[PDB]
Ligand binder design. Structure first.
Ligand SMILES: CCCCCC(=O)OC[C@H](COP(=O)(O)OC[C@H](N)C(=O)O)OC(=O)CCCCC
Lengths: 232, 56
């Protein structure tokens, strides 16, 4: 509670005092390598008492910025450029789903707009590229189109495939096995069975591909490039 | 004739206004009666909000 934040602030104070002592010692020796412009990014950024919990079998890209109370399930992939932010409430990411390139998830930061709704993601949810889910719950086994603009309060239930470029209005549920697209999300047709199988097929292939990357993206730092950067 | 009506209407109005019965009859629910706006029908469209003055 409040007491923990006081100890956190005192921790900052003592940490900065020690850091300044370190800088004085380094600078007294005639070294100024603390003035570099190294990118101070963490792929698992947190706040005082959120500390995002990620499953060990999941894969998170280095460019991903998981912030807040984001929970990641088993086998799900967190691709490059996604901006999953979960400070205000929980952001549950299902098991076996995937969050593609240049996507994100809000929690609707400002509390002025009514009550903040936590984001829930179901299992095997093939979230599309450039998805901007604005704090909406999404049930399992569904597909989200590229460039979708899901807003808060939306309940996309099972098999509710959402067309590309959709702008589904807030608090408007998508019927099961029904596609909604356009500006705004309007009924187009009913979901077919081959696409029903294709959703799970794509989820499985993306999970396997993410496993392959995690196998190859955890390679040691290859100090050859480290020497290349320094020697210039 | 139009010249023989204005004088007649003026005379009639003046004579009529001379006796008025200071307490004329007005229906009680009429505009001026003894129960005008007794228990009027409530206004058509008005709503009352409940949660006002809350925070966050
Ligand atoms: C015990 C800690 C001593 C650490 C001494 C120290 O770090 O001096 C730096 C600071 C400000 O100097 P800079 O702006 O160059 O900080 C440059 C950059 N922030 C850096 O750290 O080098 O000095 C003071 O204000 C303190 C005045 C009173 C000092 C008693």
């Amino acid at each position: 509670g409040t007491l923990g934040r006081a100890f956190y602030s005192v921790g900052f104070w003592i940490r900065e005092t020690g850091q300044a002592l370190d800088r004085l010692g380094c600078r007294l020796q005639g070294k100024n390598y603390f003035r570099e412009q190294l990118s101070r990014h963490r792929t698992l950024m947190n706040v005082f008492d959120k500390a995002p919990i990620v499953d060990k079998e999941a894969f998170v890209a280095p460019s991903a910025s998981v912030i807040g109370d984001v929970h990641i399930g088993r086998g799900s992939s967190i691709w490059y450029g996604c901006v999953l932010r979960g400070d205000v409430n929980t952001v549950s990411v299902g098991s076996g789903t995937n969050i593609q390139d240049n996507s994100l998830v809000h929690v609707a930061k400002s509390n002025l707009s009514g009550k903040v709704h936590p984001t829930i993601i179901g299992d095997n949810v093939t979230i599309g590229h450039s998805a901007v889910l604005h704090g909406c719950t999404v049930e399992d086994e569904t597909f989200i189109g590229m460039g979708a603009t899901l807003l808060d309060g939306v309940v996309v239930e099972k098999h509710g495939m959402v067309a590309a470029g959709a702008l589904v209005r807030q608090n408007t549920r998508i019927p099961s096995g029904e596609v909604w697209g356009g500006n705004p999300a309007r009924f187009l047709r009913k979901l077919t069975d081959e696409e029903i199988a294709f959703i799970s097929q794509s989820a499985t292939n993306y999970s396997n591909l993410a496993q392959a990357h995690a196998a190859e993206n955890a390679k040691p730092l290859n100090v050859i490039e480290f020497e290349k950067v320094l020697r210039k | 004739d139009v010249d023989r009506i204005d004088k007649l209407i003026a005379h009639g109005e003046a004579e009529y206004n001379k006796w008025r019965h200071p307490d004329p009859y007005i229906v009680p629910w009429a505009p001026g009666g003894s129960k005008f706006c007794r228990n009027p029908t409530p206004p058509a469209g008005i709503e009352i909000v409940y949660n006002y003055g809350l925070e966050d």
